[PDB]
Design a protein around this motif. Structure first.
Motif: not given
Lengths: 113, 379
Positions: A1-25
């Motif tokens: 009924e509900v699907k969650l689309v994820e993105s924004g992961g991967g590899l990063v160096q220490p101290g660095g930063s990432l942004r995840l996003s999640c969209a509900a359908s």
């Protein structure tokens, strides 16, 4: 009924930063709280936010991680700053319906060197 | 009143929680109530419990002080005041090391004893160990201590213990502070004796107390330890010898025999423990010497299910038994753990799956101290 689309992961160096996003359908009336857990057997709370904007953070990520929401598109964002090797895990997006049904995404691997 | 000291142990199995979500009183729209989430039978003690309303977390949720049962498994009551309306839906979410993901459970709308319970959980890297102490007279908590709380004092948790003067509270605060430091050491010597890493979290549990009959005379005394939910060392019923579980506990047993620790505990359990239990029973006679008989009723819902209820009873000791044609049926029956209502009373129910049409062949049997005769329920 509900699907969650994820993105924004991967590899990063220490101290660095990432942004995840999640969209509900689905309908905008189908999901209240949205957020992330991360795999340890168990999975630990990272951050989640209600439709009204009420946030909660796990103790290990307070001050470094920030969750936000675009209610006009039923999508949440996780700004993960000052990442450490111990932040390496699969991060699962999740959502709660207004009848307390939980939905889970497949997760995004986050690896900090 | 506590035992004066905590003897050093000396240098030289996980359970998932059972979850029940329920209201304190029968649910009624527009009427103020209390929403409860009772978690029990779990080990270790670290657990994360949320109360959910319409898909989001309720903000002001309180919980009871950490305690544990005879089998060393922990139990906690999470609760909040709420007014249930027609559209609102409630649930409880529980996270634990035994769960691959947080579990959600929806809300489907005259003997006596004194007991002290101590739990110490190491937090490697995240600070000093968490120490939680609670004192019980029967099923009523009356004192508590939390090493993370701000007061750093032994605190009252029942109205009748507030009478005690400053010398009582200063003495119990002094003892429980030393117990915290003792178990902080104990975690270190146990980690060393078992050759365990410094990064792992471990638990020391301690329980002691005394039982008295309806004549307020000494019946039994206890004093036992546990490491990570398993028996470590225990004082036998004679209050003179020790039961050690392994080589590490045998070293503790010999150090306690040489120091004559059993003689100190025997005098306390037969003397001080009995003496102050009677003082507490007298001072809180309006609360502790009451008995509330269970208000019972029966619910029905190819096959049908019969549910035998017991509500608002004290003390918590109760027996609910099913039987078909006068024969105890210990099969196809569901028996939940006795749960606290939050107001000092307790709840329990018994289920049995009966073939439809043969409902009157089953009977539910209720044994409780407040019932003059055991009851029999039948549809």
């Amino acid at each position: 009924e509900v699907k969650l689309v994820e993105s924004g992961g991967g590899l990063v160096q220490p101290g660095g930063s990432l942004r995840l996003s999640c969209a509900a359908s689905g309908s905008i009336f189908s999901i209240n709280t949205m957020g992330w857990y991360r795999q340890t057997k168990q999975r630990d709370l990272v951050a989640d936010i209600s439709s009204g904007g009420s946030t909660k953070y796990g103790d290990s990520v307070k001050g470094r991680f920030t969750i936000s929401r675009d209610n006009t598109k039923n999508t949440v964002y996780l700004q993960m700053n000052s990442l450490k090797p111990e932040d390496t895990a699969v991060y699962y997006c999740y959502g709660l319906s207004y009848s307390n049904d939980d939905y889970w995404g497949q997760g995004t691997q986050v690896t900090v060197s | 009143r506590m035992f004066p000291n905590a003897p050093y142990l000396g240098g030289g199995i996980q359970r998932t929680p059972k979850i029940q979500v329920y209201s304190r009183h029968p649910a009624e729209n527009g009427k103020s109530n209390f929403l409860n989430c009772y978690v029990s039978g779990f080990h270790p003690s670290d657990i994360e419990v949320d109360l959910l309303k319409n898909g989001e977390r309720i903000e002001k949720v309180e919980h009871s002080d950490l305690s544990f049962s005879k089998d060393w498994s922990f139990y906690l009551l999470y609760y909040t005041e709420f007014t249930p309306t027609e559209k609102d839906e409630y649930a409880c979410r529980v996270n634990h090391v035994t769960l691959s993901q947080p579990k959600i459970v929806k809300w489907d709308r005259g003997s006596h004893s004194m007991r002290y319970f101590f739990t110490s959980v190491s937090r490697p890297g995240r600070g000093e160990p968490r120490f939680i102490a609670v004192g019980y007279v029967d099923d009523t908590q009356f004192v508590r201590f939390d090493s993370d709380a701000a007061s750093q004092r032994m605190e009252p948790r029942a109205p009748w213990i507030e009478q005690e003067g400053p010398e009582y509270w200063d003495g119990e605060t002094r003892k429980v502070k030393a117990h915290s430091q003792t178990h902080r050491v104990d975690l270190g010597t146990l980690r060393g004796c078992y050759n365990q890493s410094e990064a792992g979290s471990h638990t020391v549990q301690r329980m002691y107390g005394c039982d008295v009959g309806s004549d307020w005379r000494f019946l039994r005394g206890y004093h036992q330890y546990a490491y990570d939910g398993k028996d470590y060392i225990a004082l036998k019923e004679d209050l003179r010898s020790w039961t050690a579980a392994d080589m590490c506990a045998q070293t503790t047993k010999h150090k306690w025999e040489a120091a004559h620790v059993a003689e100190q505990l025997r005098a306390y359990l037969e003397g001080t423990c009995v003496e102050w239990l009677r003082r507490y029973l007298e001072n809180g006679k309006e609360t502790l010497q009451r008995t509330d008989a269970p208000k019972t009723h029966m619910t029905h819902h190819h096959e049908a299910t019969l549910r035998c209820w017991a509500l608002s009873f004290y003390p918590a000791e109760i027996t609910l038994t099913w039987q078909r044609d006068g024969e105890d049926q210990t099969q196809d029956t569901e028996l939940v753990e006795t749960r606290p209502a939050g107001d000092g009373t307790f709840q329990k129910w018994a289920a049995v799956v009966v073939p439809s049409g043969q409902e009157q062949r089953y009977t539910c049997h209720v044994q409780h101290e407040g019932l003059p005769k055991p009851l029999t329920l039948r549809w």
